[PDB]
């Protein structure tokens, strides 16, 4: 329809939550491990167990990082979102 | 009180299930369900699909296990693709 769909507003929110955390320190277009930690702990507190051990954020960032630069860019964040969303869905069928 | 990010994830699931449930395999998007999803729910990000060939190409790109349809994991890859492209223009 002519209204922004729920899908399209979902997508916008993904962009917004990324930039809201990626913009905090260093490169404003990427999540270093500190930004990623805050994102997960503050915005995925219902889907993911809180992170407080540094080893965990290192491992998550390791699995997420495919450009090999030690940070999570938007494309890599989308892959992470895909993974998490898929997991919650698997317990919904 | 679920976050905006978490609400977005749930809406991704809800819209997949809305369209995948219409015809045939109720857990997968066939080509016609896929065309409708894009034309109905992505009209501000993607140009309307008017030709069969376009649906064919998209589904072909999306269908990585070869069954001719788009399951949820293949749908998420689609959403990642689109959202990432849009991310540039913002």
């Amino acid at each position: 329809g002519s209204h922004m769909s729920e899908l399209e507003k979902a997508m916008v929110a993904l962009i917004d939550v990324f930039h809201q955390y990626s913009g905090r320190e260093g490169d404003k277009h990427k999540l270093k491990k500190s930004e990623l930690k805050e994102l997960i702990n503050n915005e995925l507190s219902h889907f993911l167990e809180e992170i407080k051990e540094q080893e965990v954020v290192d491992k998550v960032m390791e699995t997420l990082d495919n450009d090999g630069d030690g940070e999570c860019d938007f494309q890599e964040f989308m892959a992470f979102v895909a993974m998490v969303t898929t997991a919650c869905h698997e317990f919904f069928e | 009180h679920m976050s905006e990010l978490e609400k977005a994830m749930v809406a991704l699931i809800d819209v997949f299930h809305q369209y995948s449930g219409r015809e045939g395999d109720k857990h997968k998007l066939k080509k016609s369900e896929l065309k409708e999803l894009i034309n109905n729910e992505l009209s501000h990000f993607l140009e309307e699909i008017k030709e069969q060939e376009v649906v064919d190409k998209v589904m072909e790109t999306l269908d990585n296990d070869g069954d001719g349809e788009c399951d949820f994991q293949e749908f998420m890859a689609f959403v990642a693709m689109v959202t990432t492209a849009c991310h540039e223009f913002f």
Binding site: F47, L48, E49, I51, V60, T63 | H44, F45, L46, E47
Partner: peptide, 15 residues
Amino acid sequence: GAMAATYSRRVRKLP
């Protein structure tokens, strides 16, 4: 909400 722990074709113009 369980939860999941961790470790696991043309764009419009648009103004």
